[PDB]
Protein backbone atom coordinates (compact mmCIF):
# COMPACT_ATOMS: atom_id res chain seq x y z
CA UNK A 1 0.00 0.00 0.00
CA UNK A 2 1.01 3.57 0.84
CA UNK A 3 2.92 4.08 4.03
CA UNK A 4 3.46 6.48 6.87
CA UNK A 5 7.09 7.45 7.49
CA UNK A 6 8.13 9.00 10.80
CA UNK A 7 11.12 11.22 11.55
CA UNK A 8 14.28 9.75 13.03
CA UNK A 9 14.84 10.82 16.59
CA UNK A 10 18.36 12.10 16.78
CA UNK A 11 20.45 10.41 19.49
CA UNK A 12 22.82 12.08 21.92
CA UNK A 13 26.20 10.98 23.22
CA UNK A 14 10.12 8.22 43.63
CA UNK A 15 11.92 10.71 41.41
CA UNK A 16 10.67 10.40 37.83
CA UNK A 17 12.03 11.67 34.52
CA UNK A 18 10.42 12.24 31.13
CA UNK A 19 11.65 12.50 27.56
CA UNK A 20 9.46 13.43 24.58
CA UNK A 21 10.21 13.98 20.89
CA UNK A 22 7.91 15.20 18.13
CA UNK A 23 7.81 16.00 14.46
CA UNK A 24 5.37 18.73 13.48
CA UNK A 25 4.53 19.34 9.84
CA UNK A 26 2.56 22.52 9.05
CA UNK A 27 0.76 22.44 5.70
CA UNK A 28 -0.75 25.54 4.13
CA UNK A 29 -2.51 25.23 0.77
CA UNK A 30 -1.99 21.50 0.56
CA UNK A 31 1.76 21.07 0.24
CA UNK A 32 2.22 24.53 -1.27
CA UNK A 33 3.95 25.72 1.90
CA UNK A 34 5.33 23.23 4.43
CA UNK A 35 7.04 24.05 7.67
CA UNK A 36 8.87 21.30 9.52
CA UNK A 37 9.68 21.59 13.21
CA UNK A 38 11.11 18.85 15.37
CA UNK A 39 11.34 19.10 19.13
CA UNK A 40 13.21 17.44 21.98
CA UNK A 41 11.66 17.86 25.42
CA UNK A 42 13.02 16.88 28.83
CA UNK A 43 10.65 17.12 31.81
CA UNK A 44 8.08 19.30 30.01
CA UNK A 45 10.81 21.84 29.22
CA UNK A 46 11.67 21.94 25.53
CA UNK A 47 15.43 22.01 25.24
CA UNK A 48 16.35 21.33 21.58
CA UNK A 49 14.53 22.13 18.36
CA UNK A 50 15.08 22.01 14.63
CA UNK A 51 12.96 24.33 12.51
CA UNK A 52 13.10 24.35 8.74
CA UNK A 53 12.91 28.15 8.77
CA UNK A 54 16.22 28.33 10.59
CA UNK A 55 17.49 25.40 8.53
CA UNK A 56 19.56 24.03 11.40
CA UNK A 57 19.28 22.90 15.00
CA UNK A 58 19.27 25.37 17.86
CA UNK A 59 19.44 25.03 21.59
CA UNK A 60 16.40 26.31 23.42
CA UNK A 61 17.75 25.88 26.92
CA UNK A 62 21.36 25.56 27.91
CA UNK A 63 20.86 21.80 28.19
CA UNK A 64 20.55 21.90 24.44
CA UNK A 65 23.83 23.39 23.28
CA UNK A 66 25.68 20.02 23.34
CA UNK A 67 23.15 18.37 21.01
CA UNK A 68 22.33 21.31 18.75
CA UNK A 69 26.05 21.93 18.32
CA UNK A 70 26.67 18.23 17.74
CA UNK A 71 23.87 17.46 15.30
CA UNK A 72 24.75 20.57 13.31
CA UNK A 73 28.29 19.30 12.77
CA UNK A 74 27.67 15.85 11.30
CA UNK A 75 26.00 16.28 7.88
CA UNK A 76 24.59 12.75 7.66
CA UNK A 77 22.27 13.92 10.44
CA UNK A 78 21.63 17.55 9.53
CA UNK A 79 21.02 16.91 5.85
CA UNK A 80 18.75 14.00 6.75
CA UNK A 81 16.63 16.10 9.10
CA UNK A 82 16.44 18.97 6.61
CA UNK A 83 15.23 16.45 4.06
CA UNK A 84 12.61 15.05 6.40
CA UNK A 85 10.40 17.96 5.32
CA UNK A 86 9.95 15.97 2.10
CA UNK A 87 10.67 12.43 3.19
CA UNK A 88 8.22 12.74 6.08
CA UNK A 89 5.88 15.72 5.74
CA UNK A 90 5.33 16.03 1.98
CA UNK A 91 5.47 12.26 1.62
CA UNK A 92 2.83 11.67 4.29
CA UNK A 93 0.46 14.43 3.25
CA UNK A 94 0.66 13.46 -0.41
CA UNK A 95 0.54 9.74 0.26
CA UNK A 96 -1.26 8.16 3.20
CA UNK A 97 -3.08 11.30 4.38
CA UNK A 98 -4.67 11.83 1.00
CA UNK A 99 -6.06 8.29 1.23
CA UNK A 100 -7.24 8.70 4.80
CA UNK A 101 -7.50 11.90 6.80
CA UNK A 102 -8.15 14.11 3.81
CA UNK A 103 -10.76 11.81 2.27
CA UNK A 104 -12.80 11.28 5.44
CA UNK A 105 -16.30 12.79 5.49
CA UNK A 106 -18.98 11.74 7.97
CA UNK A 107 -22.17 13.83 8.02
CA UNK A 108 -23.85 14.90 11.19
CA UNK A 109 -26.95 13.86 12.86
CA UNK A 110 -29.28 16.55 13.87
CA UNK A 111 -32.08 16.33 16.30
CA UNK A 112 -34.06 19.08 17.90
CA UNK A 113 -35.74 18.82 21.21
CA UNK A 114 -37.33 21.01 23.84
CA UNK A 115 -35.47 21.14 27.11
CA UNK A 116 -40.45 30.68 27.90
CA UNK A 117 -38.39 27.63 27.03
CA UNK A 118 -35.37 26.69 24.96
CA UNK A 119 -34.90 24.32 22.04
CA UNK A 120 -31.60 22.47 21.60
CA UNK A 121 -30.20 21.47 18.23
CA UNK A 122 -27.89 18.48 18.74
CA UNK A 123 -25.47 18.06 15.82
CA UNK A 124 -23.18 15.06 16.31
CA UNK A 125 -20.70 12.62 14.83
CA UNK A 126 -19.22 14.59 11.94
CA UNK A 127 -15.87 15.24 10.33
CA UNK A 128 -14.11 17.51 9.48
CA UNK A 129 -14.65 20.40 11.85
CA UNK A 130 -16.16 22.95 9.49
CA UNK A 131 -19.86 23.41 10.20
CA UNK A 132 -22.43 26.18 10.28
CA UNK A 133 -25.60 25.86 12.38
CA UNK A 134 -28.33 28.51 12.15
CA UNK A 135 -31.80 28.77 13.67
CA UNK A 136 -34.89 29.93 11.79
CA UNK A 137 -38.21 30.96 13.33
CA UNK A 138 -41.09 30.68 10.87
CA UNK A 139 -38.44 31.18 8.20
CA UNK A 140 -36.57 34.13 9.72
CA UNK A 141 -32.94 33.73 10.84
CA UNK A 142 -32.88 33.99 14.62
CA UNK A 143 -29.58 35.31 15.91
CA UNK A 144 -30.77 36.73 19.23
CA UNK A 145 -31.00 34.39 22.16
CA UNK A 146 -29.06 31.64 20.34
CA UNK A 147 -25.98 30.19 22.00
CA UNK A 148 -23.70 27.34 20.92
CA UNK A 149 -21.06 25.21 22.56
CA UNK A 150 -17.60 25.35 21.14
CA UNK A 151 -16.58 22.51 18.88
CA UNK A 152 -16.40 19.48 21.13
CA UNK A 153 -13.82 16.88 20.15
CA UNK A 154 -14.96 13.29 20.62
CA UNK A 155 -11.53 11.67 20.27
CA UNK A 156 -12.80 9.14 17.71
CA UNK A 157 -12.40 11.36 14.66
CA UNK A 158 -15.87 12.91 15.15
CA UNK A 159 -17.05 16.30 16.42
CA UNK A 160 -20.27 17.55 18.00
CA UNK A 161 -21.96 20.90 18.61
CA UNK A 162 -25.17 21.84 20.42
CA UNK A 163 -26.99 25.07 19.62
CA UNK A 164 -29.55 26.28 22.19
CA UNK A 165 -32.18 28.84 21.13
CA UNK A 166 -34.27 30.67 23.74
CA UNK A 167 -37.84 30.66 22.59
CA UNK A 168 -41.47 30.73 23.51
CA UNK A 169 -43.71 28.21 21.81
CA UNK A 170 -46.98 29.48 20.45
CA UNK A 171 -49.08 26.81 18.81
CA UNK A 172 -48.41 27.10 15.07
CA UNK A 173 -44.82 28.32 14.87
CA UNK A 174 -42.10 26.37 13.02
CA UNK A 175 -38.51 26.43 14.25
CA UNK A 176 -35.94 24.92 11.92
CA UNK A 177 -32.33 23.97 12.68
CA UNK A 178 -30.15 24.55 9.63
CA UNK A 179 -26.79 22.77 9.19
CA UNK A 180 -24.17 23.27 6.46
CA UNK A 181 -21.14 21.02 6.27
CA UNK A 182 -18.75 19.88 3.50
CA UNK A 183 -20.15 16.34 3.66
CA UNK A 184 -23.72 17.37 2.76
CA UNK A 185 -24.69 18.03 -0.85
CA UNK A 186 -27.55 20.16 0.28
CA UNK A 187 -27.80 21.56 3.82
CA UNK A 188 -29.72 19.67 6.49
CA UNK A 189 -32.90 21.31 7.77
CA UNK A 190 -34.80 19.80 10.70
CA UNK A 191 -38.06 21.33 11.81
CA UNK A 192 -39.93 21.47 15.09
CA UNK A 193 -43.59 22.50 14.80
CA UNK A 194 -44.99 24.17 17.91
CA UNK B 1 2.24 28.68 13.86
CA UNK B 2 -0.54 29.19 11.32
CA UNK B 3 -1.49 26.36 8.96
CA UNK B 4 -4.42 24.57 7.37
CA UNK B 5 -3.44 21.16 8.77
CA UNK B 6 -0.78 19.89 11.15
CA UNK B 7 0.48 16.34 11.13
CA UNK B 8 2.30 15.50 14.38
CA UNK B 9 4.36 12.50 13.37
CA UNK B 10 6.57 10.19 15.34
CA UNK B 11 5.59 11.28 18.84
CA UNK B 12 7.92 9.28 21.13
CA UNK B 13 7.54 9.50 24.89
CA UNK B 14 9.71 7.67 27.41
CA UNK B 15 9.73 7.82 31.17
CA UNK B 16 11.82 6.12 33.78
CA UNK B 17 11.54 4.57 36.22
CA UNK B 18 9.03 2.00 35.04
CA UNK B 19 10.32 1.90 31.45
CA UNK B 20 7.12 3.37 30.05
CA UNK B 21 6.96 4.46 26.42
CA UNK B 22 4.50 5.54 23.77
CA UNK B 23 4.78 6.05 20.02
CA UNK B 24 1.89 7.71 18.20
CA UNK B 25 0.99 9.60 15.06
CA UNK B 26 -1.63 12.35 14.94
CA UNK B 27 -3.34 14.44 12.29
CA UNK B 28 -5.10 17.72 12.99
CA UNK B 29 -5.47 16.78 16.63
CA UNK B 30 -6.63 13.21 16.15
CA UNK B 31 -4.70 10.03 16.76
CA UNK B 32 -3.97 8.11 13.59
CA UNK B 33 -2.40 5.18 15.39
CA UNK B 34 -0.02 4.11 18.06
CA UNK B 35 2.51 1.29 18.18
CA UNK B 36 1.84 -1.36 20.80
CA UNK B 37 5.30 -1.79 22.25
CA UNK B 38 4.56 -5.26 23.68
CA UNK B 39 2.60 -6.88 20.91
CA UNK B 40 4.90 -4.85 18.58
CA UNK B 41 1.75 -4.12 16.60
CA UNK B 42 0.58 -0.95 14.88
CA UNK B 43 -2.99 -0.36 16.09
CA UNK B 44 -5.04 2.28 14.32
CA UNK B 45 -7.66 4.46 15.94
CA UNK B 46 -10.05 3.70 13.05
CA UNK B 47 -9.61 0.19 11.57
CA UNK B 48 -10.69 1.67 8.27
CA UNK B 49 -7.43 3.60 8.07
CA UNK B 50 -5.49 0.41 8.70
CA UNK B 51 -7.12 -0.92 5.59
CA UNK B 52 -6.04 2.14 3.57
CA UNK B 53 -2.52 2.88 4.80
CA UNK B 54 0.24 1.27 6.79
CA UNK B 55 3.09 1.89 9.17
CA UNK B 56 5.83 -0.65 10.01
CA UNK B 57 5.75 -0.90 13.81
CA UNK B 58 9.51 -1.45 13.89
CA UNK B 59 10.26 2.17 13.12
CA UNK B 60 8.46 2.86 16.35
CA UNK B 61 10.52 0.38 18.33
CA UNK B 62 13.82 1.79 17.10
CA UNK B 63 12.69 5.31 17.90
CA UNK B 64 11.70 4.31 21.40
CA UNK B 65 15.20 2.89 21.82
CA UNK B 66 16.69 6.23 20.86
CA UNK B 67 14.40 8.02 23.26
CA UNK B 68 15.14 5.60 26.07
CA UNK B 69 18.82 6.28 25.34
CA UNK B 70 18.47 10.07 25.27
CA UNK B 71 16.51 9.87 28.50
CA UNK B 72 19.40 8.17 30.22
CA UNK B 73 21.84 10.84 29.15
CA UNK B 74 19.82 13.95 29.96
CA UNK B 75 18.77 12.49 33.29
CA UNK B 76 22.45 12.63 34.16
CA UNK B 77 23.37 15.81 32.31
CA UNK B 78 21.17 18.01 34.50
CA UNK B 79 22.50 16.23 37.63
CA UNK B 80 19.31 14.17 37.90
CA UNK B 81 16.68 16.85 38.43
CA UNK B 82 13.31 15.08 38.70
CA UNK B 83 9.98 15.64 37.02
CA UNK B 84 7.63 18.12 38.67
CA UNK B 85 4.01 17.00 38.96
CA UNK B 86 0.81 18.65 37.78
CA UNK B 87 -2.86 18.77 38.71
CA UNK B 88 -5.10 17.19 36.05
CA UNK B 89 -8.63 18.32 35.17
CA UNK B 90 -11.46 16.04 34.00
CA UNK B 91 -14.61 16.94 32.05
CA UNK B 92 -17.35 14.33 31.50
CA UNK B 93 -19.76 14.58 28.57
CA UNK B 94 -21.77 12.20 26.36
CA UNK B 95 -20.98 11.21 22.79
CA UNK B 96 -24.57 11.29 21.47
CA UNK B 97 -27.75 12.83 22.98
CA UNK B 98 -28.79 10.72 25.94
CA UNK B 99 -31.84 8.51 25.56
CA UNK B 100 -32.87 6.07 28.27
CA UNK B 101 -33.49 2.58 26.93
CA UNK B 102 -30.96 3.50 24.26
CA UNK B 103 -27.23 2.69 24.43
CA UNK B 104 -24.93 5.71 24.80
CA UNK B 105 -21.22 6.47 25.17
CA UNK B 106 -19.84 8.61 27.97
CA UNK B 107 -16.51 10.37 27.55
CA UNK B 108 -14.11 11.54 30.28
CA UNK B 109 -11.57 14.14 29.19
CA UNK B 110 -8.54 14.54 31.44
CA UNK B 111 -6.02 17.28 30.72
CA UNK B 112 -2.93 18.85 32.28
CA UNK B 113 -1.37 15.41 32.63
CA UNK B 114 2.33 15.29 33.46
CA UNK B 115 4.01 12.87 33.92
CA UNK B 116 1.90 10.51 31.74
CA UNK B 117 0.80 7.92 34.26
CA UNK B 118 -2.78 8.18 35.54
CA UNK B 119 -5.41 5.78 36.77
CA UNK B 120 -8.69 6.82 35.10
CA UNK B 121 -11.69 4.89 36.55
CA UNK B 122 -15.45 5.46 37.40
CA UNK B 123 -23.31 3.67 41.26
CA UNK B 124 -20.78 4.28 44.04
CA UNK B 125 -18.87 1.19 42.91
CA UNK B 126 -16.04 0.58 40.45
CA UNK B 127 -16.96 -0.58 36.96
CA UNK B 128 -14.69 -2.18 34.41
CA UNK B 129 -16.86 -3.66 31.64
CA UNK B 130 -16.71 -1.78 28.33
CA UNK B 131 -14.25 1.07 28.76
CA UNK B 132 -11.75 2.21 26.12
CA UNK B 133 -8.92 4.53 27.05
CA UNK B 134 -7.15 6.59 24.42
CA UNK B 135 -3.44 7.11 24.24
CA UNK B 136 -1.83 10.23 25.64
CA UNK B 137 -2.24 13.32 23.47
CA UNK B 138 0.15 16.21 23.02
CA UNK B 139 -0.51 19.74 24.27
CA UNK B 140 1.29 22.89 23.13
CA UNK B 141 2.65 23.11 26.69
CA UNK B 142 4.04 19.52 26.79
CA UNK B 143 1.57 18.18 29.28
CA UNK B 144 -0.76 15.51 27.99
CA UNK B 145 -4.45 14.81 27.80
CA UNK B 146 -6.31 11.56 27.51
CA UNK B 147 -9.91 10.48 27.09
CA UNK B 148 -11.62 7.47 28.62
CA UNK B 149 -14.88 6.01 27.32
CA UNK B 150 -17.58 4.16 29.25
CA UNK B 151 -20.57 2.64 27.44
CA UNK B 152 -23.78 3.18 29.36
CA UNK B 153 -27.38 2.21 29.03
CA UNK B 154 -28.71 5.57 30.15
CA UNK B 155 -30.95 5.07 33.22
CA UNK B 156 -32.00 6.92 36.31
CA UNK B 157 -21.89 8.10 37.21
CA UNK B 158 -18.62 9.74 38.22
CA UNK B 159 -15.12 9.76 36.70
CA UNK B 160 -12.24 9.07 39.12
CA UNK B 161 -8.62 10.13 38.48
CA UNK B 162 -5.65 9.07 40.59
CA UNK B 163 -2.51 10.98 39.57
CA UNK B 164 0.54 12.00 41.58
CA UNK B 165 0.06 15.76 41.32
CA UNK B 166 -3.26 15.24 43.07
CA UNK B 167 -3.13 14.70 46.82
CA UNK B 168 -6.41 12.78 47.02
CA UNK B 169 -8.15 11.32 43.94
CA UNK B 170 -10.55 13.63 42.12
CA UNK B 171 -14.02 12.40 41.16
CA UNK B 172 -16.02 14.44 38.62
CA UNK B 173 -19.63 13.30 38.95
CA UNK B 174 -22.27 13.30 36.24
Amino acid sequence: RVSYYGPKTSPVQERHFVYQFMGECYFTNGTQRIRYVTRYIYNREEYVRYDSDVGEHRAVTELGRPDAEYWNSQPEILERTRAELDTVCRHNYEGPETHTSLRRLEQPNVVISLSHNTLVCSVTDFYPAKIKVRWFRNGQEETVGVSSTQLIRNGDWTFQVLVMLEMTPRRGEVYTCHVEHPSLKSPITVEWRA
Amino acid sequence: IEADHVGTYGISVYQSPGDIGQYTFEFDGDELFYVDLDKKETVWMLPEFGQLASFDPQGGLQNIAVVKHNLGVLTKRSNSTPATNEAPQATVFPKSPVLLGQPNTLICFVDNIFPPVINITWNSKSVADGVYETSFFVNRDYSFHKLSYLTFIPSDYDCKVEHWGLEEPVLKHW
Partner: T-cell receptor
Framework: QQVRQSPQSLTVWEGETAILNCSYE??????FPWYQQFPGEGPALLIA?????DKKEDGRFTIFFNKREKKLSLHITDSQPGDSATYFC?????????????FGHGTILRVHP | AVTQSPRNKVAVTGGKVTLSCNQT?????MYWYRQDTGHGLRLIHY???????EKGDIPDGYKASRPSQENFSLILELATPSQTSVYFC???????????FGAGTRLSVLE
Protein backbone atom coordinates in the same frame (compact mmCIF):
# COMPACT_ATOMS: atom_id res chain seq x y z
CA GLN C 1 11.23 -6.86 -2.13
CA GLN C 2 13.44 -9.82 -2.92
CA VAL C 3 16.87 -8.76 -4.15
CA ARG C 4 18.18 -10.84 -7.05
CA GLN C 5 21.86 -10.89 -8.08
CA SER C 6 23.54 -12.20 -11.22
CA PRO C 7 25.57 -14.13 -12.13
CA GLN C 8 26.11 -16.63 -9.36
CA SER C 9 29.83 -17.15 -10.07
CA LEU C 10 32.04 -14.87 -12.15
CA THR C 11 35.63 -15.76 -13.09
CA VAL C 12 37.96 -13.10 -14.44
CA TRP C 13 41.61 -12.72 -15.36
CA GLU C 14 43.73 -10.10 -13.69
CA GLY C 15 43.25 -6.73 -15.28
CA GLU C 16 39.71 -7.29 -16.57
CA THR C 17 36.68 -5.38 -15.34
CA ALA C 18 34.12 -7.35 -13.39
CA ILE C 19 30.41 -6.59 -13.68
CA LEU C 20 28.20 -7.77 -10.82
CA ASN C 21 24.51 -7.12 -11.35
CA CYS C 22 21.68 -6.74 -8.88
CA SER C 23 18.00 -6.00 -9.29
CA TYR C 24 15.20 -5.42 -6.80
CA GLU C 25 11.41 -5.37 -6.86
CA UNK C 26 10.27 -3.06 -4.05
CA UNK C 27 10.15 0.46 -5.46
CA UNK C 28 10.66 1.92 -1.97
CA UNK C 29 14.30 0.78 -1.62
CA UNK C 30 16.45 3.92 -1.54
CA UNK C 31 19.78 2.79 -0.07
CA PHE C 32 21.87 0.08 -1.71
CA PRO C 33 25.08 -1.01 0.02
CA TRP C 34 27.42 -3.70 -1.23
CA TYR C 35 29.21 -5.92 1.28
CA GLN C 36 32.37 -7.87 0.48
CA GLN C 37 33.05 -11.21 2.17
CA PHE C 38 36.50 -12.77 2.04
CA PRO C 39 36.87 -16.53 2.60
CA GLY C 40 36.85 -17.23 6.33
CA GLU C 41 35.89 -13.73 7.50
CA GLY C 42 32.48 -12.12 7.56
CA PRO C 43 31.22 -9.46 5.17
CA ALA C 44 32.32 -5.86 5.43
CA LEU C 45 30.89 -2.80 3.75
CA LEU C 46 32.47 -2.28 0.35
CA ILE C 47 30.58 0.62 -1.15
CA ALA C 48 27.04 2.06 -1.14
CA UNK C 49 24.74 4.29 -3.17
CA UNK C 50 21.55 6.21 -2.41
CA UNK C 51 18.60 6.39 -4.80
CA UNK C 52 19.00 10.11 -5.44
CA UNK C 53 22.37 9.21 -6.92
CA ASP C 54 23.28 8.06 -10.41
CA LYS C 55 26.80 6.71 -9.82
CA LYS C 56 29.18 6.23 -6.92
CA GLU C 57 32.95 6.08 -7.49
CA ASP C 58 35.52 4.72 -5.09
CA GLY C 59 38.95 3.78 -6.38
CA ARG C 60 38.60 0.71 -8.56
CA PHE C 61 34.96 0.13 -7.51
CA THR C 62 31.95 1.89 -8.96
CA ILE C 63 28.19 1.50 -8.48
CA PHE C 64 25.84 2.34 -11.35
CA PHE C 65 22.26 2.83 -10.27
CA ASN C 66 19.22 2.95 -12.55
CA LYS C 67 16.00 3.88 -10.71
CA ARG C 68 13.62 3.44 -13.65
CA GLU C 69 14.71 -0.12 -14.41
CA LYS C 70 15.27 -0.90 -10.73
CA LYS C 71 18.73 -2.17 -11.59
CA LEU C 72 22.16 -1.82 -10.07
CA SER C 73 25.72 -2.74 -11.02
CA LEU C 74 29.13 -2.97 -9.34
CA HIS C 75 32.10 -2.53 -11.67
CA ILE C 76 35.58 -3.53 -10.51
CA THR C 77 38.29 -2.17 -12.77
CA ASP C 78 41.80 -3.59 -12.91
CA SER C 79 40.69 -6.79 -11.21
CA GLN C 80 43.37 -7.78 -8.67
CA PRO C 81 43.34 -11.42 -7.54
CA GLY C 82 42.89 -10.04 -4.03
CA ASP C 83 39.37 -9.07 -5.03
CA SER C 84 38.41 -12.75 -5.10
CA ALA C 85 35.49 -12.84 -2.66
CA THR C 86 31.71 -13.14 -2.36
CA TYR C 87 29.93 -9.86 -3.04
CA PHE C 88 26.47 -9.09 -1.66
CA CYS C 89 23.90 -6.59 -2.80
CA UNK C 90 21.63 -5.12 -0.13
CA UNK C 91 18.82 -2.61 0.09
CA UNK C 92 16.77 -0.97 2.79
CA UNK C 93 13.78 1.33 2.77
CA UNK C 94 15.41 3.93 4.95
CA UNK C 95 12.15 5.75 5.57
CA UNK C 96 10.65 2.80 7.45
CA UNK C 97 13.18 3.35 10.32
CA UNK C 98 13.32 -0.40 10.82
CA UNK C 99 17.00 -1.17 10.64
CA UNK C 100 16.78 -4.30 8.63
CA UNK C 101 18.60 -4.70 5.36
CA UNK C 102 17.58 -7.06 2.63
CA PHE C 103 20.33 -9.10 1.17
CA GLY C 104 21.07 -10.54 -2.21
CA HIS C 105 22.37 -14.08 -2.44
CA GLY C 106 25.80 -12.77 -3.49
CA THR C 107 28.04 -13.50 -6.48
CA ILE C 108 31.32 -15.39 -6.06
CA LEU C 109 34.07 -13.54 -7.91
CA ARG C 110 37.26 -15.51 -8.46
CA VAL C 111 40.03 -13.42 -10.08
CA HIS C 112 42.78 -15.31 -11.90
CA PRO C 113 46.34 -14.21 -11.58
CA ALA D 1 35.15 -4.69 17.50
CA VAL D 2 32.62 -7.49 17.13
CA THR D 3 33.58 -10.96 18.26
CA GLN D 4 31.60 -14.18 18.52
CA SER D 5 32.17 -17.21 20.68
CA PRO D 6 32.61 -20.08 20.02
CA ARG D 7 34.11 -20.03 16.54
CA ASN D 8 33.46 -23.70 15.83
CA LYS D 9 31.14 -26.08 17.60
CA VAL D 10 29.96 -29.65 17.08
CA ALA D 11 26.65 -30.75 18.51
CA VAL D 12 24.08 -33.50 18.35
CA THR D 13 20.36 -33.22 17.76
CA GLY D 14 18.46 -32.42 20.93
CA GLY D 15 21.28 -30.53 22.57
CA LYS D 16 21.18 -26.89 23.57
CA VAL D 17 23.70 -24.66 21.84
CA THR D 18 24.47 -21.04 22.70
CA LEU D 19 26.29 -18.67 20.36
CA SER D 20 27.45 -15.48 22.06
CA CYS D 21 28.37 -12.13 20.56
CA ASN D 22 30.16 -9.17 22.07
CA GLN D 23 30.72 -5.72 20.65
CA THR D 24 32.71 -2.70 21.75
CA UNK D 25 31.72 0.14 19.41
CA UNK D 26 28.99 1.32 21.80
CA UNK D 27 26.55 0.32 19.09
CA UNK D 28 22.88 0.07 19.92
CA UNK D 29 21.51 -2.42 17.38
CA MET D 30 22.71 -6.03 17.23
CA TYR D 31 21.83 -8.74 14.73
CA TRP D 32 22.13 -12.50 14.27
CA TYR D 33 22.42 -13.73 10.68
CA ARG D 34 22.90 -17.15 9.18
CA GLN D 35 24.64 -18.09 5.94
CA ASP D 36 24.00 -21.11 3.76
CA THR D 37 24.51 -21.72 0.08
CA GLY D 38 21.42 -21.10 -1.99
CA HIS D 39 20.06 -18.79 0.71
CA GLY D 40 22.47 -15.91 1.17
CA LEU D 41 22.33 -14.14 4.53
CA ARG D 42 19.12 -14.59 6.54
CA LEU D 43 18.11 -12.63 9.67
CA ILE D 44 17.28 -14.70 12.72
CA HIS D 45 16.82 -12.19 15.57
CA TYR D 46 18.00 -8.70 16.40
CA UNK D 47 17.72 -6.03 19.05
CA UNK D 48 17.52 -2.24 19.44
CA UNK D 49 18.88 -2.25 22.99
CA UNK D 50 19.09 -4.14 26.24
CA UNK D 51 15.99 -6.08 27.23
CA UNK D 52 14.38 -5.93 23.80
CA UNK D 53 14.56 -8.49 21.00
CA GLU D 54 12.96 -8.70 17.58
CA LYS D 55 12.07 -11.65 15.40
CA GLY D 56 13.95 -11.55 12.13
CA ASP D 57 12.81 -13.36 8.99
CA ILE D 58 13.52 -16.94 10.12
CA PRO D 59 13.25 -16.92 13.93
CA ASP D 60 11.94 -20.47 14.28
CA GLY D 61 14.00 -22.80 16.39
CA TYR D 62 16.15 -20.10 18.01
CA LYS D 63 15.60 -17.69 20.86
CA ALA D 64 17.78 -14.63 21.42
CA SER D 65 18.72 -12.54 24.42
CA ARG D 66 20.26 -9.07 24.78
CA PRO D 67 21.15 -8.67 28.46
CA SER D 68 23.53 -5.80 27.86
CA GLN D 69 24.26 -3.10 25.31
CA GLU D 70 27.47 -4.95 24.46
CA ASN D 71 25.99 -8.45 24.49
CA PHE D 72 23.69 -10.39 22.21
CA SER D 73 23.19 -14.14 22.48
CA LEU D 74 21.55 -16.69 20.22
CA ILE D 75 20.25 -19.91 21.75
CA LEU D 76 19.13 -23.19 20.17
CA GLU D 77 17.29 -25.05 22.90
CA LEU D 78 16.72 -28.16 20.74
CA ALA D 79 19.39 -28.26 18.06
CA THR D 80 18.31 -29.72 14.71
CA PRO D 81 20.31 -30.96 11.71
CA SER D 82 18.71 -28.16 9.71
CA GLN D 83 20.41 -25.63 11.98
CA THR D 84 23.83 -26.70 10.74
CA SER D 85 25.25 -23.49 9.33
CA VAL D 86 27.69 -20.57 9.61
CA TYR D 87 26.39 -17.85 11.91
CA PHE D 88 27.28 -14.19 11.74
CA CYS D 89 26.69 -11.50 14.31
CA UNK D 90 26.59 -7.81 13.59
CA UNK D 91 26.01 -4.41 15.11
CA UNK D 92 25.24 -0.87 14.05
CA UNK D 93 24.43 2.57 15.33
CA UNK D 94 21.00 4.12 15.37
CA UNK D 95 20.10 4.81 11.72
CA UNK D 96 23.50 3.50 10.71
CA UNK D 97 24.52 3.08 7.09
CA UNK D 98 26.98 0.31 7.98
CA UNK D 99 26.71 -3.14 9.49
CA UNK D 100 29.79 -4.51 11.27
CA PHE D 101 30.10 -8.28 11.22
CA GLY D 102 31.88 -10.86 13.28
CA ALA D 103 34.23 -13.50 11.98
CA GLY D 104 31.55 -16.18 12.01
CA THR D 105 31.01 -19.49 13.72
CA ARG D 106 30.75 -22.83 11.98
CA LEU D 107 28.25 -25.15 13.65
CA SER D 108 27.44 -28.75 12.75
CA VAL D 109 24.49 -30.52 14.33
CA LEU D 110 24.54 -34.22 13.61
CA GLU D 111 22.25 -37.15 14.17
Amino acid sequence: QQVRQSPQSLTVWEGETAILNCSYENSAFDYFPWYQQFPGEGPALLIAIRSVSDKKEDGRFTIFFNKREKKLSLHITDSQPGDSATYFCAASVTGANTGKLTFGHGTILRVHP
Amino acid sequence: AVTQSPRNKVAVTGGKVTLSCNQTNNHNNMYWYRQDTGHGLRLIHYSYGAGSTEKGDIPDGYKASRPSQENFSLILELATPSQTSVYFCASGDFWGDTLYFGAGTRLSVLE
